[PDB]
Write a protein that binds this ligand. Structure first.
Ligand SMILES: CC(=O)SCCNC(=O)CCNC(=O)[C@H](O)C(C)(C)COP(=O)(O)OP(=O)(O)OC[C@H]1O[C@@H](n2cnc3c(N)ncnc32)[C@H](O)[C@@H]1OP(=O)(O)O
Ligand SMILES: Nc1ncnc2c1ncn2[C@@H]1O[C@@H]2COP(=O)(O)O[C@H]2[C@H]1O
Length: 324
């Protein structure tokens, strides 16, 4: 098999004490593939997973719309884990780009891997982030006629925004973060790389570039409550996006077992206060210049969204949340 050292470098194994990797390392087998070799095919039954040492691969998923969604598998990453988590067929076709080496294992070695402390949770989180990219974005039409799309957040949204053309002003950032400075890389990682269970995020785009986001973060002590936050790009404000997003967030919260939303905001934020007032918010003074509220996540019919839109949002939330 491999050396414990050889596994120690894989993403999913970071921080894992050597001892826990012993049998796994002994049980995996070496793999070498040439360039342009198909490793896995979408829809096929599953046996093995692969830990990539070197080289890389294209990942290609054909969705219901018939469009192939493309991604990359890189050195340090596992591939073929999702089918083994779900007992499903392969979610994607995986083809080597350049020559690739690594280690493979079967369902037996996979069982060892998932019981390695901390690892099962990492596998699930990464699987969710991956499957999130295969969700069909939901068309949303604003009152003013603007056509946008609604989808779960993706780790890649950090890069898209930072290098994008959509502007978030100093004022917008202060209203959102209590600082006008551009959000640090560390913060942007935190905002875009999430588990969807405890921390859930919707992104609205123009069909390419993100223009807004909404998130809830489940409270540690009381799982039935979550803290919420919203951001909308300046040019996109005042068009109904925020009002839409609180509804979408409420749909996802229902799937996630979240009964109540908590919020804090500057006392001067009129648009946000108004959005929450619709849902029955009563305001407490928290710090100086900050106010807070708790509201019940609105149930059936008291959302202005309409059934078709509600069902689409519910279907997508479940796809990311419940996939594995
Ligand atoms: C809990 C936290 O998230 S606090 C921090 C929130 N984030 C920020 O403040 C950052 C900068 N601003 C924004 O991101 C956005 O403006 C948000 C999230 C505050 C609001 O979203 P928007 O898309 O602009 O709001 P939207 O157009 O849906 O209208 C909001 C509501 O207030 C009203 N409104 C719209 N513009 C304004 C305005 N300039 N001033 C006061 N009220 C307004 C609308 O009537 C609407 O009411 P409705 O729910 O009955 O339809
Ligand atoms: N968005 C993605 N990014 C990177 N790898 C992915 C992505 N989606 C799927 N995969 C990998 O492609 C594999 C195809 O088979 P599985 O569904 O077993 O497990 C899948 C993941 O390992």
């Amino acid at each position: 098999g491999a050396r414990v050292e050889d596994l120690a470098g894989m993403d999913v194994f970071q921080g894992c004490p050597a001892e826990g990797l012993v049998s796994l390392a002994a049980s995996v087998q070496p793999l070498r593939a040439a360039a342009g070799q198909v490793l896995l095919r979408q829809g096929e039954p599953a046996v093995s997973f692969l830990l990539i040492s070197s080289g890389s691969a294209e990942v290609s998923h054909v969705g219901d719309d018939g469009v192939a969604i493309i991604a990359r598998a890189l050195p340090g990453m596992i591939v073929g884990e999702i089918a083994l988590l779900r007992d499903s067929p392969r979610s994607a076709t995986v083809t080597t780009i350049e020559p690739l080496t690594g280690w493979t294992g079967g369902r037996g070695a996979f069982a060892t891997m998932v019981h390695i402390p901390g690892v099962g949770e990492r596998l699930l989180r990464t699987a969710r982030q991956r499957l999130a990219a295969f969700v069909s974005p939901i068309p949303v039409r604003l009152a003013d006629g603007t056509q946008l799309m609604l989808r779960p957040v993706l780790p890649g949204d950090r890069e898209r925004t930072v290098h994008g053309h959509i502007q978030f002003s100093g004022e917008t950032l202060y209203r959102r973060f209590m600082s006008a400075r551009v959000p640090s890389p560390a913060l942007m990682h935190y905002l875009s790389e999430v588990d969807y269970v405890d921390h859930f995020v919707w992104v609205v785009t123009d069909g390419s570039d993100p223009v807004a986001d909404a998130r809830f973060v489940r409270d540690e002590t009381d799982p039935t409550v979550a803290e919420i936050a919203f951001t909308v790009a300046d040019a996109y404000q005042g068009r109904g996006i925020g009002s839409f997003l609180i509804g979408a967030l409420s749909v996802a919260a229902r799937v996630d077992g979240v009964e109540r939303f908590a919020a804090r905001m500057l006392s001067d934020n009129v648009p946000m206060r108004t959005i929450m007032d619709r849902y029955g918010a009563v305001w407490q003074r928290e710090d100086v210049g900050v106010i807070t509220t708790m509201i019940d996540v609105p149930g059936p019919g008291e959302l202005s969204l309409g059934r078709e839109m509600v069902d689409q949002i519910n279907r997508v939330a479940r796809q990311v949340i419940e996939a594995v």
